[PDB]
Amino acid sequence: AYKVTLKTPSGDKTIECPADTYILDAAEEAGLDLPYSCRAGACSSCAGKVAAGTVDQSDQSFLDDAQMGNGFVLTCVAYPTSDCTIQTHQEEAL
Ligand code: FES
Numbered sequence: 103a104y105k106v107t108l109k110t111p112s113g114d115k116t117i118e119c120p121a122d123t124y125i126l127d128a129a130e131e132a133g134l135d136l137p138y139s140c141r142a143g144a145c146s147s148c149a150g151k152v153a154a155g156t157v158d159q160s161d162q163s164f165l166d167d168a169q170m171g172n173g174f175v176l177t178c179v180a181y182p183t184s185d186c187t188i189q190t191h192q193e194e195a196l
Pocket residue numbers: 137138139140141142143144145146147148149164176177178179
């Protein structure tokens with residue numbers, strides 16, 4: 103699996119996430135407790151910010167082009183495409 107380093111307000115926690123699993127789902131499976139609501143890519147509750155590595159969030163429908171260009175990601179609909187580092191709890195930074 104890809105190694106996803108979640109940089110959370112309570113420390114960095116590196117978890118495994120296969121290519122076919124959403125970041126949020128892998129995080130909750132690993133025992134993390136990240137924000138979410140719709141789980142449909144249509145809000146900002148689950149927003150993170152990619153610091154390194156790549157994700158595929160093609161089905162997202164809330165972030166604009168500039169926000170995605172700055173690394174913002176909807177973790178509920180984002181797959182990893184490499185080992186990656188994602189700062190969590192980023193909704194207030196949007
Ligand atoms: S929880 Fe709404 S977009 Fe992820």
